[PDB]
Amino acid sequence: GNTCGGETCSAAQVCLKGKCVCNEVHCRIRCKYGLKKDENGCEYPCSCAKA
């Protein structure tokens, strides 16, 4: 099928206007250093950052 601007979006991303972008973030956990980011910057699945 089509890629997204030539790329495959990860599970954390959505293809909007032909680019992979992080989907909206909804995490219930409350974390001392905020949420963990993947290598694209997305916060999915929800986990606390190491710091």
Swiss-Prot record:
The record marks R28, I29 as: Reactive bond. GO terms for molecular function: heparin binding; serine-type endopeptidase inhibitor activity. It holds the Pfam family Antistasin. It is found in: Secreted. One of its GO terms (cellular component) is extracellular region. GO terms for biological process: negative regulation of coagulation. Its main location: secreted. Residues 22-48 form the Antistasin-like domain. Keywords: Disulfide bond, Heparin-binding, Protease inhibitor, Secreted, Serine protease inhibitor. InterPro entries: Antistasin-like, Hirudin/antistatin, Prot_inh_I15_antistasin_leech. Disulfide bonds join C4-C15, C9-C20, C22-C42, C27-C46, C31-C48. It comes from the Eukaryota. Acts as an inhibitor of tissue kallikrein, trypsin, chymotrypsin and neutrophil cathepsin G. Belongs to the protease inhibitor I15 (antistasin) family. This is Hirustasin.
